[PDB]
């Protein structure tokens, strides 16, 4: 269950590495985001990131 090792084990798929560790193309520059609905609800409060600010 060591992520650094799991990454370099070609017999295991990338999605399986993440599952074993805890719990898909660079041709698309923009990273994945959850739906606006889910994000708007989660981000009504900015407390979870207050430490990242001065």
């Amino acid at each position: 269950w060591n992520i650094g090792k799991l990454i370099y084990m070609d017999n295991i798929s990338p999605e399986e590495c993440i599952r074993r560790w805890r719990g898909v193309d660079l041709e698309k520059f923009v990273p994945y985001f959850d739906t606006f609905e889910k994000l708007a609800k989660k981000w009504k409060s900015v407390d979870a990131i207050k430490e990242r600010f001065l």
Binding site: I3, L26, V30, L39, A40
Partner: protein, 355 residues
């Protein structure tokens, strides 16, 4: 011809890594089962762009476009114009040039023509405020993307000038083991062929989500009209969390479609920026592949980069597997000594002169 890859996945990265390493590669089974097999017009256009900036490369594409053999030439650069097909905006073509330009014999001075924005690719602001500050941290002192004309989809008519005056031996060795503190939020809300009210409405939406934060929020209103605004109505917004101390940045971007609400776009991108910050450490997910490659190609020394657990996704995994196939370099990950977060340190021995 012998280091072999499968599918269209990471096409630009694989060609970029082959170019930087000087190692020949083969990309096979590109969209093999599809009705329309092989390379898309934008991938062929990207290969023509690679040929224009290098000298002595051999590019062989199979009849149906399902196989590409790439024997890289030396990075030469120079002044050229690249016509981007409608299928991809200018950013799709500018982005891989960022990985090559500082390592060229001559300066890259490339005029890119076509659509300037999409929902999936790096926009003008993403390059200028997201990627370029990362390359500056790596020693690319002078890099610029000049916006001559904007070109919203579907008709485009945009024009950007990429100029990388800084030619360096290799990126400097990366040492960022802290979580940079965000000092302010900036951004650019732009529009083409429309009333100035649309930009003001996006800024209203973004401000509604960001007003709860303890920092300054200053979003630039960038209204484009007339000839230099391109051929189609359009609008978009890029929001950038700035860290003044060292010059790090976090960003989110998107464009609006016809009939969409500008306030909603502003809100969404602001929500996406906060989400990107929550998932970040030294850099955001959209700057991480560039930062990773720049450390792989540094001098023979250990570079350190703080990464968030949320950044170790399937995209990060495939990136690392592609790097190892080309350079044989492994990224080592060690947890931080802190209990406040679950971040880790990515340690990378730069390639230097190693073969």
């Amino acid at each position: 011809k012998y280091t072999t890859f499968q599918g269209s996945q990471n096409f630009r990265l694989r060609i970029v890594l082959a170019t930087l390493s000087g190692k020949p590669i083969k990309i096979e089974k590109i969209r093999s089962g599809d009705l329309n097999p092989g390379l898309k017009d934008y991938e062929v256009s990207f290969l023509r762009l690679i040929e224009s900036v290098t000298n002595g490369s051999v590019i062989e594409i199979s009849y149906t476009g399902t196989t590409v053999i790439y024997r890289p030439g030396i990075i030469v650069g120079g002044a050229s114009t690249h016509i981007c097909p409608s299928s991809k905006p200018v950013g799709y073509f500018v982005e891989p040039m960022l990985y090559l330009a500082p390592f060229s014999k001559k300066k890259f001075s490339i005029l890119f023509k076509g659509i300037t924005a999409s929902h999936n690719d790096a926009g003008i602001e993403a390059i200028k405020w997201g990627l370029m500050p990362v390359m500056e941290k790596f020693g690319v002192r002078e890099c610029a993307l000049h916006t001559l004309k904007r070109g919203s989809p579907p008709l485009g008519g945009g024009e950007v000038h990429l100029v990388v005056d800084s030619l360096i031996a290799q990126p400097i060795t990366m040492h960022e083991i802290d979580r940079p503190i965000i000092s302010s939020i900036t951004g650019v809300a732009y529009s083409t062929r429309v009333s100035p009210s649309l930009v003001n409405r996006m800024i209203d939406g973004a401000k509604k989500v960001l007003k709860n934060l303890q920092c300054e929020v200053n979003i630039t209103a960038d209204v484009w009209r007339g000839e230099n605004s391109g051929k189609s109505p359009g609008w978009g917004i890029t929001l950038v969390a700035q860290s003044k101390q060292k010059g790090w940045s976090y960003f989110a971007e998107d464009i609006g479609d016809a009939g969409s609400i500008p306030e909603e776009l502003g809100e969404k991108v602001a929500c996406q920026l906060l989400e990107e910050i929550s998932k970040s450490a030294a850099v955001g997910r959209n700057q991480l592949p560039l930062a990773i490659v720049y450390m792989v190609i540094g001098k023979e020394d250990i570079g350190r980069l703080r990464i968030n657990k949320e950044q170790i996704d399937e995209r990060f995994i495939i990136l690392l597997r592609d790097i190892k196939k080309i350079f044989n370099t492994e990224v080592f990950l060690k947890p931080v000594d802190e209990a406040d977060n679950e971040d880790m340190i990515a340690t990378i021995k730069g390639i230097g002169f190693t073969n």
